[PDB]
Amino acid sequence: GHYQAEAALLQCTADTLADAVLITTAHAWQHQGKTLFISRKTYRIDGSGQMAITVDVEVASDTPHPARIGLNCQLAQVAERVNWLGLGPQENYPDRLTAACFDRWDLPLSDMYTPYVFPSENGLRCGTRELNYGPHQWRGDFQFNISRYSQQQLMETSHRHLLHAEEGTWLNIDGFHMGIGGDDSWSPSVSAEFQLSAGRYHYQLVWCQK
Amino acid sequence: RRDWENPGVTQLNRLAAHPPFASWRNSEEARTDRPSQQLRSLNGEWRFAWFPAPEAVPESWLECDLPEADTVVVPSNWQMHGYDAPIYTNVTYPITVNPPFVPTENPTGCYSLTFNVDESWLQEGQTRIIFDGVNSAFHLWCNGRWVGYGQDSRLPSEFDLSAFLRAGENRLAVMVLRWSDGSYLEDQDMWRMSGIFRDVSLLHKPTTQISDFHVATRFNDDFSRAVLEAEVQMCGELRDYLRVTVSLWQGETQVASGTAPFGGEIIDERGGYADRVTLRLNVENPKLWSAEIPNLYRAVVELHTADGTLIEAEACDVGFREVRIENGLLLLNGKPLLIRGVNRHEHHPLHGQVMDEQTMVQDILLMKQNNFNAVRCSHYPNHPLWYTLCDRYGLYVVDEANIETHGMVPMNRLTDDPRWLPAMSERVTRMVQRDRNHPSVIIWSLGSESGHGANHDALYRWIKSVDPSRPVQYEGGGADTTATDIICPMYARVDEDQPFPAVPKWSIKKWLSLPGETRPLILCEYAHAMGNSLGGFAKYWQAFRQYPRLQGGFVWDWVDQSLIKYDENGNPWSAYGGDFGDTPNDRQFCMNGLVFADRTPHPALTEAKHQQQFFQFRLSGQTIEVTSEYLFRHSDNELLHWMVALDGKPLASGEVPLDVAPQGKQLIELPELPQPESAGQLWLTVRVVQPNATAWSEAGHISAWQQWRLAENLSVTLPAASHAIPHLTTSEMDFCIELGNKRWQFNRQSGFLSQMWIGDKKQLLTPLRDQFTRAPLDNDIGVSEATRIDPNAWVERWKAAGHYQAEAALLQCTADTLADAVLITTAHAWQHQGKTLFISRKTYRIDGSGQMAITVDVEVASDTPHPARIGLNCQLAQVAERVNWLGLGPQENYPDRLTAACFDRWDLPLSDMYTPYVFPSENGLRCGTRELNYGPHQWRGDFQFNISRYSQQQLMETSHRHLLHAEEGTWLNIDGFHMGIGGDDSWSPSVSAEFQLSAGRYHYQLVWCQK
């Protein structure tokens, strides 16, 4: 029920600090009264205007390990370039990132999308410490992709040529991402060390407008 | 003549070696293995006097006793009585390297004994004396006259005394030299002792006698039919009326018998052996011998006259088993063995190297109960009873020649020298000549750590030629030379290659498939069990299991070679190298055991027991699939015991008998498990139990166990909104958080929780601070010393980068008041010579319910040696009697050594949370702990911890356990992450990459409350 699971709100508080406001949330994702994922966050916005996101996810031991643990959102902005400090320049995933080098990379947006004839998840870059898009900047230690196509659209489209640019830009930021397999394409082939099975996962982001 | 400095003379007038004799004069006695009148022990009180060299022995000592001499027990090592210091040395010879010479100052032991000999023993027949072991060489006198000389301190020297003894009163004089040319061949890694340390006896044989006998068993294709073959040899005057009968009994039934006159078959142009006979008996459906079922038969060899009159009878146990290598596998009775072995030195903490029945029985039961099935005699032939015991209890033995020349440069200097061939050959040939009849001996070994030389090649072939029933192995000169049937490396890693020039240690999985290689691989020494070790043990056993030609190994080693010393109060403490004045020495390197000298198990032993299980399990749906790794036995004394528990609390249990064929499967369906309501993780635990006592275990003995995570219901129900709200008190010095009676002090200048209060009772003695180090284990130290630094060992990389000299520099301390809690945010940087090693960013969150939530986020500089741990520590004032925890236990367990541990609720006395490693190090950690309870305190999270009355600093600074003092209060280390412990070897880094803390950024969270 990973595709069907809906967030239930457990907690949502606000506090005023000396130099910041702190928002504290907690969600459960459930399916048939089974809890799959719990997501405990904090958001810390201070006088500098930086948003310090902290995410703490729990994953039921008996659910099949997730494909990723991350945040997504559709940005209004449509910028021409993408600029990041991390593994690149090409698409790279956890079990396929030896070819990529760590450096400051600047590409056009269309280079962040891989035109696989059969549409799927694509264009992830790993080991990213800084991501720049238009006015936005995310800092931390994550994996991300950024394209004009939602995961939903990719999932529902059987051919690349039938895909259409969505209004705004879809950003996928992941603390963690499952490996991609390949040993074959007819049985589970993602090796154990690239499966998201730790049970509890942590990642922290900082979102500013520089 | 100085025979002890001449390797061409290894004995004078010594009698031919042969298997165990008893010279029974009664068939039944021989059959039932009763004591024999013709075998008298001379063990007991002797007269001994020490000397500094032989030239200092007064010539009167041959003739009559020395008044200065003391009365001491024999056997013994005279080092254990205090006459000189036992020397511990590993590689470097205890003497100057100058072959064949020894030091002029040669500690000489003078043994004498006045004793009776009966009239009937001299009127006719032969009377010999037997010294089962004498270290390292000796001359023998009897009633003043000289008898002979003998070397090789691990095989029995025998001399014919017939013409020396007189009726009634007799006197032996045995001058024993500590050092001889033999000592060049005796460079094993152990204490270097001496004296008459094995049995002494008198054997009376008739003039016409059985002088030797060999037993062999050949089989058909399926082992339903067998021929036993006994060659019997004699000394004395041959006679046309002489006869031999070889009779095979199983228990009390006689299964087969053969009688024949002497006169062998024609062997060449000159005829045959007139003084020999071979008896061939058929045996249908023989009960086959194995470590699984040691079915023994009994062979009686009767020398007697045609008319019926018995002259004498000898006997041995016979196990029907075949040992061969075929298509690259070591088979026993057609089945490919999996060796769960161990090396075992002959060692006792009090008696030195003197062996006894009780200790050997002890060792075997311990080994067997811990799922061992094979032993290697490192590095010498054992006390003779040891083989009788392995024959009967069932252990596969590797019999090793008493040859080791580790100290030489190069290692094969003597073993490649033809002038050393003679000395070496006697050390091999006499081993085979003594031990070839024991079913437990499955493999002969040519010795240890003596490089590779043509002498090895010659002897290897010798064995193959004389005894083709057993494979031959030898490690030296690369572990895969032309002198070994089995690739038997020492400390070869599972995945990692170690490509040393000339003599590389390849990864065992790669080693097998090198171009042209076809033999089986069984490690002669692996998983160095020195102190807190055996990390990475699971990797070997997974590898053994997957690879058919990886057939196991022998762990190093069984028992710590620590000796007993006493302080001023007569209190006993365990001692190692250098503790006797002995120098140069290799300090703690003698204690590599899975057990302490007194046979107390190290935490490492249980890891072995688990990994070496004979039953393998998988879980699919709710089906348990039990797989038997037994080769011959059915699971005829086992029943499976499962239970399902939610965070410690038992929900359901069952009991199903086991009925698996060797190599077979059994499917077991768990009933519908009643799905519980409340949050937490369900855990299934199976364990295999033996309902009945056996020769080796008590009733109810657990032989195997495993766990799986079943369902988990994550926790989704908010904690009920607090009644009260904590109060902050600001101060230029402190932040003080109060709530009810409870108080929390955060020193604003250090940045740590300095003190906690319950009413007016102090909790903390030292404040709660991060810790990124541990007290170096042996595998952390390696071979690094004060005078010889090895910059590559873990302890030294940590030292040089300042991990131990690092001081916390406060970056940030702030307090904030929330709706229902107080929030402290702290930040620290640890530095050294201006290099930031670690950054620690924490938050403490104290709510109305009186629960404190710590959030730790550590950074580690990529270029600093990966830290030994990432955690928190403090000294609690409280000292309680118990420790209660929800996590892996019950015994000590580390990340790369936690497979044997089970998740459950564990209650133990505080004392059991400390492990008395003789050299103290970081110890007692338990992993995957979700809840810890100490007195009033409770910590929750997902962490590792250890808890004791010794600080990390004390354990670090103290050399022996007996010098540790309990400190005020209780020290607690709570690790978010802990480095592995290594142990593939103990002389280079051995912590596998996946167990080093290299992530860079680490996260853990705690909840601290007083329940």
Ligand SMILES: OC[C@@H]1[C@H](O)[C@H](O)[C@@H](O)c2nnnn21
């Ligand atoms: O416990 C030290 C061990 C032990 O002496 C072994 O017999 C030998 O293979 C060795 N080589 N280097 N260190 N060792």
Ligand SMILES: [Mg+2]
């Ligand atoms: Mg000699």
Ligand SMILES: [Mg+2]
């Ligand atoms: Mg050695």
Ligand code: NA
């Ligand atoms: Na194997």
Ligand code: NA
């Ligand atoms: Na050793």
